[PDB]
């Protein structure tokens, strides 16, 4: 078979990390696809509901309150060794034992019996994970405190879905694991291809994995590379890549203008949002602490800064119809849990913003054009990120809108922030105190609960709010009462309304994705529910 050439659009170097628990970014998660997507276990239907037949099956027992995972008999690592029950449990240790440096702790994992006490070092094992046919068998039982309504769906976050190669990694010290060749350039994997070579920061050469249990691929090889935003269209014009994933909305018209490509589409499981920095993360106690001293402590300020943006004007000018101003944090793909009732910051309202600030005592100084409260000037730092050729223009455009409401906003270090640096800034405890506003974007988990973005114990709560109303909202969505979908829908609506009113974050955009595919390629798809794409693609 053929030799496929794929890229992911990224202005930052690739961060190869083959262990899901230690990898935070969508870029490498996507590039890992041919190798098993960081060793994902379960197949799903097009509604993300688990089905039988993947690398493993999962069975829920709601009476016992357990999940039982059965790995295929012939599931192997790419060195021919068996994938075992212990490999599945070891994924949990990579997140829960703090020595590995994971940023993926969350209150969802507290619902596994014994896992909280393992995470704090009070227990030396995870009591709720046991092995009915031993560590070297194929079966794992996970004991919960309670079932959660999302457990039928991949991405639920209450039980994990990947394996880690424990026998391969057991003599690498936890503190060294993320930077070891064994999780970066020289991993074991379980997918239809294995990474024969990895060039740090740049590329992966994939060849078939002869130990794969499933459909054997048609292709001889796949190369997967990063390509910059400024070089992407020319790469398609010159046929440098057969497929490019992750392309920005601003290039969509150029891409449709090209001869020799089919352009695929999907509803993006995505949200972008503006964050306010309101606290710090306490690593010892695994808790967000909302104690930062800032004008952003004033609810009226948070709301005003949201109302002053012109997100619809930006989307109309630049996005080629692919971005839609978001009304809430729950995107359209989760159609059962959205409501046209919910009003957010999708319409600019400069008059309301100015009124809110006047009402809150932030009085305009007519000499300077900026507002003040008891001598404090309303000045903030905006950690805007590098993007496409329009990113500087768009960030300055928001600064200009904020000046209209008497808020002085300046870029972090007078420039846009590189992506890998920004991720370090956001995740490294205890968090930084030198930014006020930033923009985040998420390739969301395929189940709509946002515990793993905002729960009190999660470092992924980048602005470090900790609010009883929000915490009760998040818990209500996943409660036993939410096993009635009527109740869960109302809980989702309340959460969306409460997040918009508290305005600790402001929803920005929903999106459609697109991927150009050279006409020589057959079998590529963006359809959800396609489980064997990498084995089906050919030239």
């Amino acid at each position: 078979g053929g030799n496929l050439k794929v890229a992911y659009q990224s202005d930052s170097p690739m961060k190869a990390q083959w262990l899901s628990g230690l990898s935070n970014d969508a870029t490498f998660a996507t590039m890992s696809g041919p190798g098993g997507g960081q060793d994902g276990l379960f197949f799903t239907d097009s509604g993300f509901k688990f089905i039988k037949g993947g690398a493993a099956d999962v069975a829920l027992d709601k009476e016992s309150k357990t999940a039982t995972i059965t790995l295929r008999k012939d599931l192997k690592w790419s060195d021919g060794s068996e994938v075992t029950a212990k490999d599945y449990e070891f994924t949990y240790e990579t997140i829960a034992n703090p020595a590995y440096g994971s940023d993926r702790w969350t209150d969802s994992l507290a619902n596994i019996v014994g896992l909280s006490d393992y995470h704090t070092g009070k227990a030396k094992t995870i009591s709720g994970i046991t092995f009915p046919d031993g560590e070297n068998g194929k079966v794992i039982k996970v004991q919960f405190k309670e079932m959660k309504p999302g457990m039928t769906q991949s991405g639920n976050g209450y039980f994990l879905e990947t394996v880690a190669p424990y026998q391969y990694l057991k003599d690498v010290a936890p503190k060294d694991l993320a930077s070891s060749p064994k999780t970066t350039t020289k991993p074991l994997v379980t997918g239809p291809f294995k990474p024969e070579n990895v060039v740090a920061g740049e590329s992966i050469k994939y060849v078939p994995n002869p130990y794969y249990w499933g459909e054997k691929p048609k292709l001889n090889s796949i190369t997967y590379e990063v390509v910059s935003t400024a070089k992407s269209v020319a790469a398609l014009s010159s046929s440098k890549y057969d497929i490019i994933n992750g392309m920005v909305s601003s290039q969509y018209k150029q891409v449709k203008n090209l001869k020799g490509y089919k352009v695929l589409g999907q509803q993006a499981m995505y949200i972008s949002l503006m964050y306010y920095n309101l606290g710090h993360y306490d690593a010892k106690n695994s808790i967000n602490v909302q104690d930062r001293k800032t004008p952003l402590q004033d609810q009226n300020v948070r709301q005003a800064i949201g109302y002053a943006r012109n997100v619809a004007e930006v989307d109309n000018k630049f996005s080629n119809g692919l971005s839609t101003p978001a009304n809430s944090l729950i995107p359209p793909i989760f159609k059962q849990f959205t409501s046209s009732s919910v009003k957010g910051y999708e319409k600019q309202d400069l008059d309301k913003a100015n009124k809110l600030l006047d009402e809150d005592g932030w009085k305009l100084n007519k000499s300077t054009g900026y507002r003040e409260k008891d001598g404090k000037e309303l000045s903030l730092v905006y950690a805007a990120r590098v993007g496409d050729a329009n990113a500087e223009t768009i960030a300055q455009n928001y600064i200009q809108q904020w000046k209209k409401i008497g808020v002085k906003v300046s870029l972090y270090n007078g420039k846009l922030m590189e992506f890998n640096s920004w991720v370090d800034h956001m995740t490294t405890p205890p968090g930084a105190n030198d930014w006020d506003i930033t923009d985040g974007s998420w390739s969301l988990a395929s189940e709509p609960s946002q515990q793993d973005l905002f729960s009190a114990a999660a470092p992924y709560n980048f602005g470090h709010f900790n609010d009883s109303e929000i915490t009760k909202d998040l818990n209500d969505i996943d409660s036993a009462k939410s096993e009635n979908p009527t109740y869960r829908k109302a809980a989702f609506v309340k959460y969306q309304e409460d997040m918009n009113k508290k305005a600790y974050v402001i929803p920005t955009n929903f999106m459609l994705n697109y991927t150009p595919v050279n006409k020589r390629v057959v079998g590529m798809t963006l359809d959800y529910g396609a489980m064997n794409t990498w084995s089906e693609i050919g030239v």
Binding site: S12, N24, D25, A29, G40, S441
Partner: peptide, 8 residues
């Protein structure tokens, strides 16, 4: 399936 930080 998990939440991942996107560059755009």
């Amino acid at each position: 399936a998990s939440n991942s930080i996107a560059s755009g």
